[PDB]
Amino acid sequence: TEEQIAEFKEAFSLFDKDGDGTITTKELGTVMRSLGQNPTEAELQDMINEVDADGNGTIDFPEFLTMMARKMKDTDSEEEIREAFRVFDKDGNGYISAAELRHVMTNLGEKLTDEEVDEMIREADIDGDGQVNYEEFVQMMTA
Amino acid sequence: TEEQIAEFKEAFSLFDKDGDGTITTKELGTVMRSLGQNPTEAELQDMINEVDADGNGTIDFPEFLTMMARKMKDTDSEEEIREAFRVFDKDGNGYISAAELRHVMTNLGEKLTDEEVDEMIREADIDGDGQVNYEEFVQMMTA
Amino acid sequence: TEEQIAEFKEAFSLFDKDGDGTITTKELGTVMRSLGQNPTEAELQDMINEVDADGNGTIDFPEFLTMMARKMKDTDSEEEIREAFRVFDKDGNGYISAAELRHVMTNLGEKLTDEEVDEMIREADIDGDGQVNYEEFVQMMTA
């Protein structure tokens, strides 16, 4: 819809700082700092690698629009989530304890709050029995 | 017997310092310091791991009582002692020299005094010939 | 021809500084510094190893004359260039992109200017289509 396109254009303009028609490394760094997390040069390089595809050293608007258009169904990442959980699935049966996820997820990677891992469990564990199934989570939303 | 239970309760109270009904990491550290050896955070973590089983971060009284009740016969550690001696049994025949034990045991791990390794030999080597047998030691007391 | 021999003698004399009839390590270092690049002791050792063959610790004139006489056809280095390109030939088909060579050659080893890698491509890529062939380059000049 046109409203979504206008919102994406506004977001790109907000990311844009010097008005060169593109989002540069410094703009990514300053938005990262504003979000609260201090960025790194390698982090911004990965930023550009994910976004940039033409190899220009910056980020353009059509690429951002196309990527935002790509929702979960175009990510083909079901196998990636399955592998991640299998790595988490120590026993391999297909059951993950809620407590282990709460303790590790809040102490590994981009750690979140306790309520956010409660939301983890609620979204993944449909029955809310505290036993998360990997396949159900990977297919329920992404697929 | 009731006397042993009372003694264990007194020991737990002595370990208890702030009177929270449990033995915490700081109490373990201070008792370690009182004993003479300076403790470490990892050492107290292993403390809790050995004692704690419910995963509460502290030590409770019933667990201590049950563990003290467990004597050598419930340790199922005969194979562990056998493996330790086999590691000590360089030749593998089943004979260990008294002098080697005296020199190493007092210079490895929680080193003790010379008389304590003399007691090592006396307890293990029943015949007192200076030749310690691993199986006789592992089965004589623990089994 | 006699003119080339005289020019080589003049070059050797220019390399010669103390007039001992040979080019020593210090002369190699000072000529390296004059060229612009700061030399290293290991670099001068490799210098001598390449030039010296009799094992005297210095460089003599007949060896320099003979080496200068050896043109590409006596280098038997076709296989070396083939292996280098195959290492560069990621796909192994026999095609190398101009952009990758421009970006790497100017950022690896004795890096040169952009026009010098343009000359790379022009000399190697005869058709000038931007797709360099390894075998054509190794055989066109060295062979």
Added chain:
Amino acid sequence: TEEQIAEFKEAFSLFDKDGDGTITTKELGTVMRSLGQNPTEAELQDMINEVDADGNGTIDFPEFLTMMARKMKDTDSEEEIREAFRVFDKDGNGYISAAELRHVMTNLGEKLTDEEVDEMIREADIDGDGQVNYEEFVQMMTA
């Protein structure tokens, strides 16, 4: 003969400093320093290990007398010299160049003077052609 025994006793007394009937670690260190080379604690430990056999921490006189009695024929070290030369025998044919021995022996281990490696070659290379044979050297003296 009695003269050799008296000379060995005089040597032991010279090594002896505090007159305890044995050569201690400190005496070995001070004699090493007098010889010109600065000793090390590990070096003196190896000293004692080579000399001492009863495990007393020092060196006694009968052991020194017996060791001095042991001449090359009791060393059973022919295979050790053969292996050392084979390690030196890069080609494995059984020929070692004089120049390589002169350059390495004076720049490896307990390096000696140029005349001492000339003596190396003279003793090993009987014909004095500059080509040392390993087997001839190992068997000529030690065997």
Added chain:
Amino acid sequence: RNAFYRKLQNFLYNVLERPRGWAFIYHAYVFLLVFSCLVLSVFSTIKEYEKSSEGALYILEIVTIVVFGVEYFVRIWAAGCCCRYRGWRGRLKFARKPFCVIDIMVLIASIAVLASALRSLRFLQILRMIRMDRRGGTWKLLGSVVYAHSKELVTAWYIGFLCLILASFLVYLAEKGENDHFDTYADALWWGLITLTTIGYGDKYPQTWNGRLLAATFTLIGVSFFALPAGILGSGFALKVQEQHRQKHFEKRRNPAAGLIQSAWRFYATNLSRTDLHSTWQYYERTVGLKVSIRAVCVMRFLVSKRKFKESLRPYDVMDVIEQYSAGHLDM
């Protein structure tokens, strides 16, 4: 009672679809069933044993049809474990999988046969034995091992074929005149194949001194080079097992996966797929238009984490330590 429903469906799907441990027990039994039928089928081709064997085979085939139909229906139901095959549409899609199609085809063919037909019975037996794979794992593993050792296998095949041809020709020359075994070069080639393979039927063998001498000199090479492909393949299989074991011991990909799941949840919450997802937004605002910027940065974080996890998703034995030490040394 949907918790027990889901648990039972999970167990059934695990047993029927890719099994890991004791589930194979069930499959073994099923295989035995099929195997039994096959054996009885063979006993039905012998006139003497036709009566009893066919009498038992009819009952066993009815039992096999019942078991396979029940298994097919239970598999179709248990496919609901995966949300991909959810609902009637998902179940039908699962039933559309080519191997499930072959399963239902075999079931219907057996039902029709049991309702001259022994030929189709044998065909169904072999086909349902092929069905045992359902994934091509055996074929894929064999192909990977053969490709890995393709050059060595080609060497063995080439030299062994040359040895066969040469031995056959020379023994033919030696034995053509005074041995009815080697009447034509085809007989010589048959003898060479049956000798170098070490089968040695004994229908043909050299009987002259020339023939026996040549056979002795060439058989030693030929038998070895004919046994070489089996040895190469067996050693390759064992070495593949070893490397797979080491790699499994070196999965070492917990942290990238944890970051992946973290950023995946962040992307799910930031996106407007649901409206109730607002606590993560409050967490982002407390940790500091703005919402779209947060969404974009979060999805890009998800993408970078995905790529980082994928790059580390190939843990190997020696390259791992080599690269780790290179990183440590350049750090130094």
Added chain:
Amino acid sequence: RNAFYRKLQNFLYNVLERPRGWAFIYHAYVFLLVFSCLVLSVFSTIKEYEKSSEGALYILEIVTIVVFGVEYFVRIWAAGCCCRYRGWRGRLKFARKPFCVIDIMVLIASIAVLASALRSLRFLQILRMIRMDRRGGTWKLLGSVVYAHSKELVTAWYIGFLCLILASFLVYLAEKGENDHFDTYADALWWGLITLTTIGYGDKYPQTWNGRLLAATFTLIGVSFFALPAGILGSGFALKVQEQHRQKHFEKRRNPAAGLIQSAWRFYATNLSRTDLHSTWQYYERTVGLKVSIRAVCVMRFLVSKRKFKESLRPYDVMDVIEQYSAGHLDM
């Protein structure tokens, strides 16, 4: 004279129970004895050689009974080496071990037989040959290797069985009419099994051009895939030997065991199992109610040391260096 008593008992228990080196010599001799009897038993089933073979076999079986009875009694006595089997109660418990029960059963059966019985004699021979293990080590090792290479073995079995079935069927079609060897599909399957196994009796072999061509094309694959399981198992055995050798070279568990024994003695002395143990208490007091606290801390030290030793009790080749370098790098 109990020192020599204990030394002799130790030596006898080592020789009879798990042997390591030259003790096996004795076992070999015993095996030879049994083996000899078995061979003579076979010679007793031939009418021509019955007389002499049975004459020698009677004496050899009496000798075997005497040797096995002496060995059983000596084993029962030497079990006193281990304090677990101490006293009459401990010795009886040792005699209650299932394999010792089988030993005494074999002894009593042989005594009864020697006091038509040749059938039971053969049974006892095979049973006492099975007795050679006494631990299942052979079976456990075979099972471990088979499980490790289960997938490769299944691949080989599947493809080889398909090859057997296909080759047998095609050669049957080729040879059914004009070869009495292939009269029924059972004959074809028998030929295929005896060919792909490379046994090649020669009772059946293709004689047509179709049959020989099909046999040539399919035998090459079939023989290789039938020899594959043996090659896989042999390579797995050799690789297991290699890894075991490396792990043995990397026991590297002296210090955890030393700490374990230290804290074990500390726990023994602190506990009130004995009253004379007081020197360790004096050492604790000089290195500083209190006694119970010391006991508790000491037993907890023993537990932590036990767990630390157990964790390090699995030294491997590549994971060891990987983890050690990871620790070094995170230290850096």
Added chain:
Amino acid sequence: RNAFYRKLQNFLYNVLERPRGWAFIYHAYVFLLVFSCLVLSVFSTIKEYEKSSEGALYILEIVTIVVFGVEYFVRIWAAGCCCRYRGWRGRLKFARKPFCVIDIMVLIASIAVLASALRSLRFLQILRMIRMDRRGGTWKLLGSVVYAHSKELVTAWYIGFLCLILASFLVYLAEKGENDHFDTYADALWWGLITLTTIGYGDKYPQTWNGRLLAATFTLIGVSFFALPAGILGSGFALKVQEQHRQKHFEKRRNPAAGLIQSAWRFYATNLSRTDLHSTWQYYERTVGLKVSIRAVCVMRFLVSKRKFKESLRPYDVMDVIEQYSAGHLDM
């Protein structure tokens, strides 16, 4: 239109000369063609099938001649891909390569035969099957593996030959009198060779008790030691594959090659082979008689880079890490 010309020539040279991937498909087809002819040739030696087989074989041989001639001409043309075989002189030099000479010889011989000749036809078939290598890769690989395991192979051969001799002699002694199979020691040796190789024709086998006992005791050792060379070679092939795979994963020679090419271009530009090459001279002058000194230093830089690249051109598995850690530790 020379761009498409060069692309087509490159593709054809890759397919005909050293192929890597799907190019082999073509070769396979060609091989099949040749193979078919060979098979038909065999069918032409049988009187019953002579008519049809020869009728098809004439056409197939004409097709093979056409295909091989086209391939030879296309290979001669595609050799222009490499500048070494450029122009008429270069193409003639390529045609002078010994294997191309053999190719044209085979083509001319087949043309002459197709224009008693069946013998030369068979010779050409075998020769053009040998032609399949064109490089000796199979022979070189076999020789390398045999040399690597030369000592183990010699052990196996020695012990197996001793076992053959001893078993043959003892079974001869056992069977000389009462078995017409073993009439002379030559018969015993033939039986031993055909037994220990496991071929087992069945023309000779022991029939006495002495002979069968001796055969049983010695065959177990002999068959194992005769199968040993094949197992050794197969395991060596597999291990070579493993080490080659690891080394390929560890090429790790990008930077030395980059420096090599850099200094190679520098040497090319500095040298007076061309007059237009002056921009590099300007770069050298801007980065600071002089020209000859620059040429000399540049060529010496090329030489040092060449030697450095060559030294690193042998990347191995364990020596690489050992040397890297030694360098790191001496740095520390």
Added chain:
Amino acid sequence: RNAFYRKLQNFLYNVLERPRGWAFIYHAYVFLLVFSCLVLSVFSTIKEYEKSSEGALYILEIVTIVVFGVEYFVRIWAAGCCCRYRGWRGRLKFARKPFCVIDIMVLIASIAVLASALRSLRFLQILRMIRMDRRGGTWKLLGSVVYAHSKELVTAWYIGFLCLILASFLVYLAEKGENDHFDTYADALWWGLITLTTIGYGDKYPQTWNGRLLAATFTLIGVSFFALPAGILGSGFALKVQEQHRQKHFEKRRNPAAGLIQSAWRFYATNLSRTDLHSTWQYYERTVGLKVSIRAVCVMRFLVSKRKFKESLRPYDVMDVIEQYSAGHLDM
């Protein structure tokens, strides 16, 4: 002219005694010679070929005697290369070596025979073929590999023997009544041995349905477990080759050997074995009773260097890097 004398003696000793490269060529030729005689000897046991074979064999045996005598004398002379076998005493001691004694015994026996004797001729042929080793290298290598894989070999032997016994007994029960092949259990055991070894003579094979079914089920296991020992030994040989190759690449013992030779010369010069050795004494005095102290310290330096070199004289693959990194980490 003693330089050329010593060079020739060195070359001859290298060729005759332990050879490394092309020297083996000579040995091969010699072996061929002996081999030829052996073959001719076999042809002399056949009445038809006795005349020509013996006519050639006489000349070939005279040639072999001449060659072996020349080789023995040249070996005795070339032993002077080693100073241990120097002079007449040293040469006689070399001739006293047991294998040289066997060599001269074989020479004298052949001379006597050539001066019914065909039996001793065959004995000499086999003995001089055994002579090919002269060191036991083949036997030592086989023993080392067998010992390394002793447990796996015992597993294979045990399970295969059980399979043989069980299959033989069951097929005997199945075939005793209606198959003259299995008349006694000895016949069944012979069939089982000839089947599981895969030799398959065909003199005995099951012909009932029970027998063929039991044979089919048990042969699959038996053939694999009978081929297992060969596969285990071959894989062990290949893995030993691999580890030896790596260890050879990791000799890495230059510096300890250099220190060893340095201190060895120092000990030689310090000791009073010679009087002219005084320059090293001057070097010691310039680098500072005293002479005896210098001698003692020097010999002790030699001893410490010897022990250090010996300790490092066992360079291995993984323990080397493990210990090196442990030293580096404890340094850190």
